[PDB]
Ligand binder design. Structure first.
Ligand SMILES: *[C@H]1O[C@H](CO)[C@@H](O[C@@H]2O[C@@H](C)[C@H](O)[C@@H](O)[C@H]2O)[C@H](O)[C@@H]1O[C@H]1O[C@H](C(=O)O)[C@@H](O[C@H]2O[C@H](CO)[C@@H](O[C@@H]3O[C@@H](C)[C@@H](O)[C@@H](O)[C@@H]3O)[C@H](O)[C@H]2O)[C@H](O)[C@H]1O
Ligand SMILES: *[C@H]1O[C@H](CO)[C@@H](O[C@@H]2O[C@@H](C)[C@H](O)[C@@H](O)[C@H]2O)[C@H](O)[C@@H]1O[C@H]1O[C@H](C(=O)O)[C@@H](O[C@H]2O[C@H](CO)[C@@H](O[C@@H]3O[C@@H](C)[C@@H](O)[C@@H](O)[C@@H]3O)[C@H](O)[C@H]2O)[C@H](O)[C@H]1O
Ligand SMILES: OC[C@H]1O[C@H](O)[C@@H](O)[C@@H](O)[C@@H]1O
Ligand SMILES: OC[C@H]1O[C@H](O)[C@@H](O)[C@@H](O)[C@@H]1O
Ligand SMILES: *[C@H]1O[C@H](CO)[C@@H](O)[C@H](O)[C@@H]1O
Ligand SMILES: *[C@H]1O[C@H](CO)[C@@H](O)[C@H](O)[C@@H]1O
Ligand SMILES: [Ca+2]
Ligand SMILES: [Ca+2]
Lengths: 253, 445, 230, 253, 49, 49
């Protein structure tokens, strides 16, 4: 479908971190109940041809056009061993489904009411900050995103459940065509979800860093206030690297 | 033998272009740090560096573009004169040397074109072939369908790509990887021609990479301004007077040209480069850079005088002087375009220039750039000499053919005349509020 | 005896290939062919091409001198990384750069070399791409552009622990890679930093590396020759 | 598989202590629960093709590409008498296994969860400080390393069990190819375990020294504080030899 | 070319950055005198070759 | 001032772009041949003849 010009352009527009002399992998929890983050939430349920990010993801999974992988605690492996079987994802999470009337582009029949488009209220974003060798500038690259369903815990209480890992390269072509609105004060649909992620318009706090002990923030931060403090400290570390790269603002001469 | 002296090259002479100023190399933070918060548009900023270049002092005027149109008209008329169908006078098409050596067939511009009163019947027919007369109003005007410019451009950057090396072994320097004979590199190029029926056929050829001709693009572009924009841009307005007289009145000669599309601007730049090369003598080995549309990074850097503290092409944050005079031609009030004195584009250089010496970088007419439009393009461009270049395929979706527009125009609010605001337009669309100026990379040390 | 036949013409396409999404083809067309760039450092030169140039320089020098019987001279060569770092810091362990002070600018605010001082700001020192040689002050030894401009090849093979594996006297880690060797074994040390490097990489102690067959728009080189002195 | 050039270069990079006029053997304990030491720990369990040092050692022993010897108390003897039999090492340490589906590079079948790659949180490093006769400089050479399992002592309490001795020459070729990251603040995998050991980036305390009585520190230091004090004293002795070698910083003239 | 005298120097830096995650490595060495090009090789000098 | 065969021999090393018609030295023809004697390897004790 894509022309040769378009393929060349897209291949030219990708981020390569192959020879980066500095890298840092960061896991961020992006909460959809915050402004500048609800871009991936609107609409909570499909409105005609308008779907949010999870509606698109589920629709692509109902086809055979997107491969997702189990959310394993501690590590991610996007190999065929951990590839998720769609049939054994719905009954696992209590999603009522019916046999499909077409085997093409629909593995099962799921009603919009059954799809947890509005229940998924957070995402896990795996970012990689890198330092470009040739250009000598810092950039961020999205690796994968994990939707978090926030239903009601049995017997009471709430419970957040990660669903699966979507490598960003797999979903990028599909979300580069969906035009969305980035604000409530301006409802023009002038951007895309791909632009939303590439421009880094989401705001989340750090929940994990690639460290030598494979430790998450929760393992050594008991209270939410401490989690916020640790996230702020890590963000200060990243900004400190960025600032220490350059010297034009040092007027101690 | 001996010591290690240098093998110096013969010094070259750099012809400073007429009507241009020199913009020095420097750095600037493109974009705005703070957002409006009522336009609902997040603020995006990026620091970049650019090299020195020549930039037109003002936007291209009606007379400057009429020069291009008249050159096209004269070339087509001469080609028809030395043609069996219309004329036959071979003196208009040189095909041999004085010594009789066959040479490339080319026009002989030395001999003047026959005057309408002094020209014979065949010459009159050849001249009239490029004109159209309204059967009702009996007005003779250049036929837009006949005003087509042909030109070719070599893709130097694409030819230099490692993936595009003409030898497979030279496409990968990693010695661990073997060269596969079955590997073919698909390349796309633009070609255009005129069929026997006289229609222009343009297409994008996609084929395996085999020769240097894979990097040559050919275009035949109708270059007559789209004067109907005035009518089409503004419904329920009495704007047909400008559609009739803006590009055709001597009083509007020094006003910026409008109704010019991105492709027509590129054709004009190619013609300007060809003209300049034709009118100069160059020492052996001399290489010159052609006239081109500016990149949006170059345009923003030049408009703000290479200073990140400027939001407009002037030092002050206000839109007026101390005496209350506006610093550009735009729409300052509500339904009030004339608060600055002008309703439609004004004569170029009607306000004060930049610290760089540039005029009308804010207001008057918005200006084409060579950058393809992307919502995240400031992040996708490079740090040095940033550029986002796309040569759209003819069968590409229309959405992929948008180009960045900079500056704001006579009909824009103060927000859009800010040097950081980006607009866009389709490459085949001409507007009554979009013009352009050209740049030229300068060889400076 | 090792015989080589090396294509020695500079790779002018490096400018295009190093910087995607930039207007750098002008340098691919003019940098090595314009008389105005004659005194600028040569870039796009590979390690093997630099070795061939040094061999040609040695042959040229020998061809034009009359030597008394028995006189054996040393050939031109790329410096070792230890030699390069010793020369750049003026043989003083208290220097981090090829100058005495720890700052990067003089008292009048002028930068001491051609690198990338600011973020997206290459021209803060007055030059975006490499500048003409000798545009800044020299070392105490009298060397120019030991920091910035173009990073420089050395004859030392690159190892993450190479300082520990070299000798105390005239340190050198020399490797002649085989043609069928894995590509990872063909990396050579690079020193000095270039016009596109942050202040960290123009430090005389920072080590970079590049594959021996790769030319870059920011890597040049200079020659050394062992001197018979008493 | 190596080329003659590579063989010659490698044999040129080996440390020889043949005619050293001075030698000293030190047994250090490196704790993997310390930053700058977890380089040998990450990842605690294999993440795809990424393995920590003990995972690599166990995999090599599952083949017949590495010979390891029993850890005896008092002395080390790397002879065929003390060669460890992989069969009589899994049961002795409670590692469940199944018959291998192949006999090539697989003596048995051990699951990743069964392999104690996260329980091994300490190493015994046997170093030899030596004075080079021709060059007159001090250097450190690695002789062997012993993984220490830090499982749970039966009936309560903790128990550390040394597993076996791995001569460094045996493992050097295998760990010179795997890339790792040396920091939690920079996740670039620009180094190898061989570089980690050769550059002496590990930080351990002296637990034993070669002495005429064959005494370990644990036999005359009753408390951890005293053991740390003795380790500090021995490190001071080593640094004192190194410093007394040279006279270039003695301005008493 | 200029002459560089024989001498000794401690290659490397003693203190690291702690944000680049690269440990400091230093080693003192000695080198003999040698001639070194005053500037790096220019375009014309390579054009001679 | 040369002859036909001289012109052929001279042009043998040049390459002209068929599109833009620029005549530049052919990189595939600018090849330098040279030998180096490994004195250090010849002086090795293990490499005695
Ligand atoms: C004039 O331009 C119009 C387009 O605006 C052409 O008309 C088009 O083509 C005709 C056939 C059809 O009716 C339509 O398709 C119409 O749109 C018209 O043909 C004329 O352009 C053509 O003729 C020009 C001319 O004769 O001057 C050409 O100019 C160039 O031609 C030479 C091509 O090699 C070139 O000479 C070469 O370069 C110079 C620097 C020197 O080295 C010389 O020795 C070389 O041969 C001329 O300098 C150019 O001016 C034009 O390209 C061509 O399309
Ligand atoms: C764009 O492409 C079309 C072809 O798709 C060109 O052909 C036109 O279309 C036909 C239908 C009309 O009758 C004419 O108007 C006709 O000219 C069109 O002109 C444009 O041409 C441009 O692109 C060509 C391409 O990419 O194919 C360029 O290369 C061609 O011409 C070369 C001329 O030397 C030719 O090389 C010669 O032949 C080959 C077989 C070989 O022997 C070689 O050594 C010869 O020099 C190429 O093979 C052609 O591809 C063309 O120059 C350019 O104007
Ligand atoms: O002395 C100049 C002074 O300028 C301001 C701050 O950047 C200070 O840190 C600095 O010391
Ligand atoms: O008097 C010089 C003085 O310098 C310092 C130390 O090295 C002292 O031991 C010495 O006495
Ligand atoms: C909250 O406080 C705890 C204990 O000090 C920390 O571990 C955490 O990082 C946060 O600061
Ligand atoms: C702790 O104390 C004991 C007893 O003095 C010592 O043997 C040991 O070395 C450490 O100092
Ligand atoms: Ca304007
Ligand atoms: Ca330099």
């Amino acid at each position: 479908t894509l022309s040769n010009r378009a393929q060349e352009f897209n291949r030219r527009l990708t981020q390569k971190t192959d020879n980066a002399p500095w890298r840092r992998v960061v896991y961020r929890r992006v909460d959809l109940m915050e402004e500048s983050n609800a871009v991936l939430y609107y609409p909570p349920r499909p409105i005609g041809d308008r779907k949010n990010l999870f509606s698109t993801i589920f629709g692509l999974i109902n086809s055979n056009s997107l491969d997702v992988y189990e959310y394993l605690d501690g590590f991610e492996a996007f190999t065929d061993q951990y590839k998720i079987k769609f049939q054994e994802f719905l009954d696992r999470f209590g999603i009522y489904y019916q046999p499909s009337t077409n085997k093409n582009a629909e593995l099962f029949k799921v009603a919009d009411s059954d799809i947890p488009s509005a229940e998924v209220k957070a995402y896990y974003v795996k970012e990689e900050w890198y330092f470009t060798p040739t250009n000598s500038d810092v950039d961020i690259k999205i690796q994968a995103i994990c939707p978090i369903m926030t239903g009601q815990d049995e017997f009471g209480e709430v419970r957040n459940q990660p669903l699966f890992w979507i490598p960003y390269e797999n979903i990028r072509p599909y979300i580069a065509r969906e035009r969305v609105m980035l604000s409530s004060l301006n409802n023009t649909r002038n951007s895309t979800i791909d632009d939303f992620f590439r421009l880094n318009l989401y705001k989340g706090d750090i929940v994990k860093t690639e460290n030598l002990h494979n430790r998450a923030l929760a393992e050594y931060c008991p209270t939410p206030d401490s989690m916020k403090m640790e996230s702020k400290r890590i963000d200060k570390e990243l900004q400190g690297f960025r600032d220490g790269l350059f010297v034009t603002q040092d007027t101690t001469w | 033998g001996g010591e290690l002296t240098g093998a110096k090259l013969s010094s070259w002479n750099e012809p400073s272009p007429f009507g241009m100023i020199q913009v020095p190399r420097g750095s600037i933070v493109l974009g705005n740090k703070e957002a409006d918060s009522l336009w609902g548009i997040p603020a995006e900023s990026r620091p970049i560096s650019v090299d020195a270049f020549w930039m037109d002092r003002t936007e291209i005027t009606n007379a400057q573009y009429r020069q291009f149109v008249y050159y096209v008209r004269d070339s087509i008329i001469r080609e028809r004169l030395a043609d069996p169908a219309y004329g036959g006078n071979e003196e208009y098409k040189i095909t041999e040397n004085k010594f009789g050596e066959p040479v490339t067939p080319h026009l002989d511009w030395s001999k003047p074109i026959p005057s309408e009163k002094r020209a014979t019947e065949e010459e009159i027919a050849a001249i009239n072939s490029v004109y159209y007369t309204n059967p009702v109003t009996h007005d003779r005007k250049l036929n837009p369908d006949q005003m087509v410019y042909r030109y070719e451009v070599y893709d130097y950057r694409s030819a230099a790509l490692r993936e595009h090396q003409l030898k497979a072994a030279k496409r990968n320097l990693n010695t661990d990887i073997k060269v596969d004979p079955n590997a073919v590199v698909m390349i796309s190029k633009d070609t255009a021609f005129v069929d026997e029926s006289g229609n222009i056929i343009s297409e994008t050829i996609t084929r395996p990479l085999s020769s240097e001709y894979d990097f040559l693009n050919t275009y035949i572009v109708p270059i007559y301004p789209d004067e109907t924009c005035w009518v089409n841009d503004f419904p329920n307005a009495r704007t047909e007077i400008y559609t009739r007289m803006y590009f055709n009145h001597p009083g509007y000669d020094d006003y910026p040209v409008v109704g010019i599309s991105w492709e027509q601007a590129q054709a004009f730049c190619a013609w300007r480069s060809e003209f300049f090369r034709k009118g100069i003598r160059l020492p052996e080995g001399q290489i010159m850079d052609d006239f081109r549309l500016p990149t949006e990074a170059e345009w923003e850097y030049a408009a703000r005088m290479g200073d990140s503290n400027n939001k407009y092409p002037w030092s002050t944050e206000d839109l007026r002087t101390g005496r209350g005079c506006f610093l550009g031609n735009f729409k300052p009030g509500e339904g009030d375009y004339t608060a600055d004195g002008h309703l439609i584009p004004s004569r170029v250089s009607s306000f004060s220039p930049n610290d760089f010496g540039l005029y009308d970088m804010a207001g008057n007419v918005a200006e084409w750039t060579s950058t393809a439009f992307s919502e995240s393009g400031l992040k996708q461009m490079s740090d040095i000499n940033p550029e986002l270049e796309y040569k759209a395929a003819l069968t590409d979706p229309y959405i992929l053919k948008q180009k960045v527009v900079r500056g704001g125009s006579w009909k824009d609010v103060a927000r859009f005349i800010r040097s950081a605001t980006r607009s866009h337009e389709y490459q085949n669309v001409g507007r009554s509020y979009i013009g352009f100026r050209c740049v030229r990379t300068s060889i400076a040390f």
